[PDB]
Amino acid sequence: PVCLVVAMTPKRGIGINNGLPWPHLTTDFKHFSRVTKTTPASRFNAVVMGRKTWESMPRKFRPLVDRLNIVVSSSLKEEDIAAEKPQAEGQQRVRVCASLPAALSLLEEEYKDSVDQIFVVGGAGLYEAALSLGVASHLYITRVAREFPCDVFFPAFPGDDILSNKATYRPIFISKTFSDNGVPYDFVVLEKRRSSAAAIAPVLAWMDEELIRAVPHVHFRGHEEFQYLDLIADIINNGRTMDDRTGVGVISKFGCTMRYSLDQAFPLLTTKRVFWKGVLEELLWFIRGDTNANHLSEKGVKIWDKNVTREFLDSRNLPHREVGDIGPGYGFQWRHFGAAYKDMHTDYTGQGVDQLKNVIQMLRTNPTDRRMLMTAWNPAALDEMALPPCHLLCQFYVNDQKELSCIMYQRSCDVGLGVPFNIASYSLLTLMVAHVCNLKPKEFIHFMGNTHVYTNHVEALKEQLRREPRPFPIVNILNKERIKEIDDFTAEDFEVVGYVPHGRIQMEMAV
Amino acid sequence: KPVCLVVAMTPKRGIGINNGLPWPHLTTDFKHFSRVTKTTPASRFNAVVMGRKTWESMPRKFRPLVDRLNIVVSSSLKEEDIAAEKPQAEGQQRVRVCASLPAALSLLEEEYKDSVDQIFVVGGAGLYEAALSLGVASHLYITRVAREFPCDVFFPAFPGDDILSNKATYRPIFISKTFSDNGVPYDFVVLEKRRSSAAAIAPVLAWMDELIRAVPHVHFRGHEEFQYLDLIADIINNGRTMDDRTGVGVISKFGCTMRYSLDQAFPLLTTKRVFWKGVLEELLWFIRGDTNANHLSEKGVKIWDKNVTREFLDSRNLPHREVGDIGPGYGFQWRHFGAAYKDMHTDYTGQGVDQLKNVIQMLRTNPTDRRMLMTAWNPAALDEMALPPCHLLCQFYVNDQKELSCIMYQRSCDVGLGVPFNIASYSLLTLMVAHVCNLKPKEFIHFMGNTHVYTNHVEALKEQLRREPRPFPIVNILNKERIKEIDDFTAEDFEVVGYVPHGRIQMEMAV
Ligand SMILES: NC(=O)C1=CN([C@@H]2O[C@H](COP(=O)(O)OP(=O)(O)OC[C@H]3O[C@@H](n4cnc5c(N)ncnc54)[C@H](OP(=O)(O)O)[C@@H]3O)[C@@H](O)[C@H]2O)C=CC1
Ligand SMILES: NC(=O)C1=CN([C@@H]2O[C@H](COP(=O)(O)OP(=O)(O)OC[C@H]3O[C@@H](n4cnc5c(N)ncnc54)[C@H](OP(=O)(O)O)[C@@H]3O)[C@@H](O)[C@H]2O)C=CC1
Ligand SMILES: C#CCN(Cc1ccc2[nH]c(N)nc(=O)c2c1)c1ccc(C(=O)N[C@@H](CCC(=O)O)C(=O)O)cc1
Ligand SMILES: C#CCN(Cc1ccc2[nH]c(N)nc(=O)c2c1)c1ccc(C(=O)N[C@@H](CCC(=O)O)C(=O)O)cc1
Ligand SMILES: O=c1ccn([C@H]2C[C@H](O)[C@@H](COP(=O)(O)O)O2)c(=O)[nH]1
Ligand SMILES: O=c1ccn([C@H]2C[C@H](O)[C@@H](COP(=O)(O)O)O2)c(=O)[nH]1
Ligand SMILES: CCc1nc(N)nc(N)c1-c1ccc(Cl)cc1
Ligand SMILES: CCc1nc(N)nc(N)c1-c1ccc(Cl)cc1
After folding, report:
1. How far is CA B447 from CA A3, A130, A166, A273, B164, in A?
2. Number of structural domains, chain A?
3. What is the least distance, in Å, from the CA of A400 to any CA of chain B?
4. Per the record, which residues fall in region Thymidylate synthase (chain A)?
5. What is the C-alpha radius of gyration for chain A, rounded to an integer number of angstroms?
6. Which residues are near ligand 1 (CB < 6 Å)?
């Protein structure tokens, strides 16, 4: 019973020029060391590596301390390694075998009392052999989210859908996303499948007195996307069927919550492709205080079009509004709160309260202040808007370490469509604010009021819950030196790195 | 050998009056009793031991207790007196009579070994007194009836009866959430006499894996107050030390959530005495749109006085404000959002947005609407206020069963002083609205931004965490027929029932 341990690109790449394809990944190395070393006294673990993998290792690190090193080789000899460096006291000598079956034979013959676990450590020669013999019970795979130039690859395997889009290996463990040197990655483990409380017990039994799961097989759910996935499952299982303004049936819950880290990776949901071009353009649109939807529409972002049509503006009793005008919508209240609205063509400079500017100035001068808020909800202007703001409020917070966190409150949440878009939107805002204020992005916290999935999304979401999430990508602000104020950001100042989502799922917008 | 006591008790230890139960029927308690006394893992049954009067107080259709060996402690009653009282049913045990409790336990050893599993002392005072004297009681199943009733028979005094009211040991290991039947709140406690299937995943868990706890011995933490208590412990252990507007030190966290049920009982925190007169008078003050703090101060509610002094108004750069004038604060924005403020003496009827009326009218006509929000945050009027609103937004929600839920977002939360007050303040509003909209109150959900404990509260809070909570009280709206609109409520239309909190703890307000 052997296990495989690997770091791997989305296209199964593992090595180039007898070396690692990516810059150093410190956390992955700490992970490798820990898994391969840890034992419950009398026993040590066995690491089996190929010749080239042995050679790729720096001479300082080889042999891997506290582990029985085994090199599969025809050309190298046991003395070549013995003469490479003097053997340190209290360590087992490196054994060389012709093949992997021979390497396992040696473990049975000589070492059956000494070793607890066996690890195949690389490279492509040993992984392929181990997969051929079917001796692999588990696969410890570090999923490098970025693609790098490679000449050596891990062989394709039934269940390699965890890496990219296309006896079996099913994920049983998925971690949160880490990143080092601008390279996002996470850790998965795949399994070969094919009277202390006795007094309390009867009281609990009477009390309890009375279906849909996300990726049920995955037992450790470290990935932060599971929040969203369990949140879907939760509303489908425990929500209530309600009527709606849209006329479409809704299954709803009230007062749900999610929070996402921004220090390592970006919470751009991987279980379905997120229209990032849309989130970026809408946020930049918001920041300008622009209320003209045709500016978004001309850029290929048609997210507001169905709610600024002649027919919708008239159902909203605003026949004087031009097609496209969202009225005093989100952006207008951010930059000109309480200002008298005319149309989308009017210059509103200096008018109203510039909430965004006040939030930033307070962050840069007095970050312990507890009044760092930005609201889009204006009861006086609600009837003039094409649609009342969903995401209506956000608060900022700075800790000891100059780390910035953002809460956002949403009155109404379309889980299937709007939420993944809203997560990414305010998470992006946090990065942008964090940079302009000289702060580290830490956390985005999502507070939700009426949390609902539309009936016509249910089947499509059930499909989405069979999908095990991929590592979160990294969003980089480019041209950091040029950007000094929040208005300095443009569409091209952003780069989404290592985003490998599952395919797009069609979900109609409830008009 | 060891026995378990099962009781339903008044705060003053009362268990009975006129050879009967002091309170109206509590179905859930009667269920609890039935299940704990009956449940067994085949061949065995449990034994219930009672006094002569406890047997007599019991209805005839219920005695003997089915599927349980009944033992009566008596000197006058004989075994044939009971047998002639009712024909023994097939399968059931014959009721035994013993001259004492030690004689009862001796019979359980002599004739009923291999027959009985668990022994339960079931009353009354005579038997409870003896079982505590002998020291054979390993566990006490106590149903804490929060309401005081006329009683002539009492449960004996015991070390650790501090769980009932204010003043070898019996410490709580289980505290449930508050239930209520027939307007009588109660909960359940259990005391204790003290004086490679998944293992191939654990190594990766090991390296990813990592001081103050409230009532740590209590293992089952059903009581919803534990939310508040664990939130205190969480801030102290994991929070970050920041500076603050007031100058007083602060330990803080960001993005905290609590929720409290409103259907059974009221979340008026029991682990310290909450100034309820203050929560009621301030809320009615809000409802009136009153900005004059002297109207609260005349009634003995001085919660606002330290922020309306000549000194604080001037430090806010408001020299023209009369002493008491909070400016356009919560009350004002609720009933007159956007209205141009003059002073506290001006009549603003018909001016600005009446958010409260809009919320109620929407609830009564279109409850599936997702825009039922009320906000106090008005960035245009913030500088004119004496203090920017802490609790700045609340949203309402109605479901299938005409049940009302309410979320309140609070930008800044003084956990020691303000939080308990705010929980009661909006939970009371939810009651008030629910009645006026013909809806059942369901849940209050607390969303918290900058959640902090002041450094001069830390010692007093550590003391508070040693206290286990008491059952929640019921808040009754009196004169229901008279009250039809939200403005109809008065200070006299409310009744707190069964409130038994711990002693007040002095906590200075950071000015
Ligand atoms: N990211 C990751 O997880 C890891 C990546 N790597 C990378 O992979 C590369 C090294 O792997 P790779 O190039 O495949 O070389 P290997 O480590 O597979 O070793 C190849 C040599 O070992 C012997 N050998 C290997 N497999 C067998 C077999 N089944 N039977 C008999 N002999 C065998 C052969 O010797 P002979 O020719 O004499 O028969 C062969 O020349 C490096 O670039 C390294 O950086 C390495 C480890 C982990
Ligand atoms: N809420 C609750 O948890 C419960 C409440 N109750 C209430 O309490 C009342 C009954 O309690 P209480 O008034 O104390 O009466 P008890 O049930 O304790 O019975 C008293 C009688 O039982 C016999 N007895 C009891 N203890 C002993 C002893 N140690 N040695 C010898 N004989 C004993 C004696 O009967 P004799 O004179 O025949 O020898 C005595 O007169 C009722 O009103 C009932 O409603 C009862 C049970 C549970
Ligand atoms: C939230 C938000 C911003 N908005 C604004 C907006 C306006 C009204 C709404 N109305 C309703 N009922 N649901 C919404 O999600 C919604 C969203 C969006 C609007 C549409 C799409 C959309 O058509 N779907 C995208 C998929 C993006 C994704 O997967 O998240 C598409 O492919 O076109 C996205 C965002
Ligand atoms: C929140 C709120 C309303 N308010 C208004 C108010 C105004 C400014 C504040 N400022 C700060 N820093 N903390 C607060 O809690 C606070 C509260 C209150 C103010 C004081 C007390 C108070 O002195 N404590 C009560 C005990 C009440 C309790 O048990 O919680 C007392 O007995 O005096 C209560 C409520
Ligand atoms: O950023 C947004 C904007 C809109 N919506 C969805 C949620 C609501 O279902 C709908 C707005 O309709 P009302 O909540 O106004 O009924 O749009 C979002 O989820 N996110
Ligand atoms: O209803 C209230 C009023 C005040 N505070 C507390 C929280 C803050 O610690 C303090 C106000 O300080 P700033 O947030 O304004 O700095 O008062 C509350 O918790 N609830
Ligand atoms: C530390 C990188 C690493 N990460 C993972 N997840 N698996 C591995 N097998 C390795 C590895 C690294 C160097 C060598 Cl020489 C062999 C294997
Ligand atoms: C069901 C009320 C009840 N609740 C609790 N928690 N304990 C009890 N011992 C009883 C009880 C009730 C009736 C009799 Cl006759 C004896 C005991």
Report:
1. 46, 52, 42, 30, 31
2. 3
3. 6
4. 223-511
5. 28
6. A 6-7, 14-15, 18-20, 50-53, 56, 72-75, 99-100, 121-126, 129, 152
